[PDB]
Amino acid sequence: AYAQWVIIIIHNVGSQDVKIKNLKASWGKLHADGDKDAEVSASNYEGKIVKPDEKLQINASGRSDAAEGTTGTFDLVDPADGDKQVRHFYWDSPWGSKTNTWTVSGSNTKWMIEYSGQNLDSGALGTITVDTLKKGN
């Protein structure tokens, strides 16, 4: 029963560009770094490239005065391979004592993806770092 939020940090730790697509919060809203009430457009991120050694930070929060959590999805795609999907991502940080969800799905064996930081218990889902590396087949 507290304010729900997530921060997703995509860190490209490989040598090949990765691209974000289809970023959509189904509950709550995307917001600016360090201000959970300052809504931003998904077009700030849609189609953006994360270059080698760069980070891209996405922040989402619920409507904390309406007992609302935040839920959303995005894809990473490979801009050198026709925007082939790398992985699909899903977050859910429901309001209350409810368990959170952070799911990475899909397959693309040219890429390795590692994540950590998620809080799956009660409370906000929190800060999740996603490391991306194109390893080839």
Q: Which residues bind Na ion (CB under 5 A)?
A: 93, 100
Closest to Na ion by CB, 34 vs 121, is 121
Closest to Na ion by CB, 64 vs 73, is 64
Q: How far is the CB of 119 from Na ion (least distance, A)?
A: 8
Closest to Na ion by CB, 8 vs 77, is 8
43 phi/psi in degrees, rounded to 5:
-65, -15
Q: How far is the CB of 125 from Na ion (least distance, A)?
A: 6
Vertex 133 angle, CA 129 and 137, to 5°: 145
Q: Which two tokens stand for residue 133?
A: 């590396």
Q: How far is the CB of 2 from Na ion (least distance, A)?
A: 8
Rounded Cα–Cα distance for residues 9 and 58 (Å)? 6
Alpha-helix residue ranges (DSSP H) falling in 8-101:
none
Q: Are the C-beta atoms of residues 59 and 70 closer than 8 Å to each other?
A: no
Q: How far is the CB of 56 from Na ion (least distance, A)?
A: 24
For the four alpha carbons of 113, 119, 23 and 103, in that order, the dihedral sign comes to: positive
Q: How far is the CB of 93 from Na ion (least distance, A)?
A: 5
Q: Are the C-beta atoms of residues 50 and 56 closer than 8 Å to each other?
A: yes
Closest to Na ion by CB, 55 vs 98, is 98
Closest to Na ion by CB, 12 vs 28, is 28
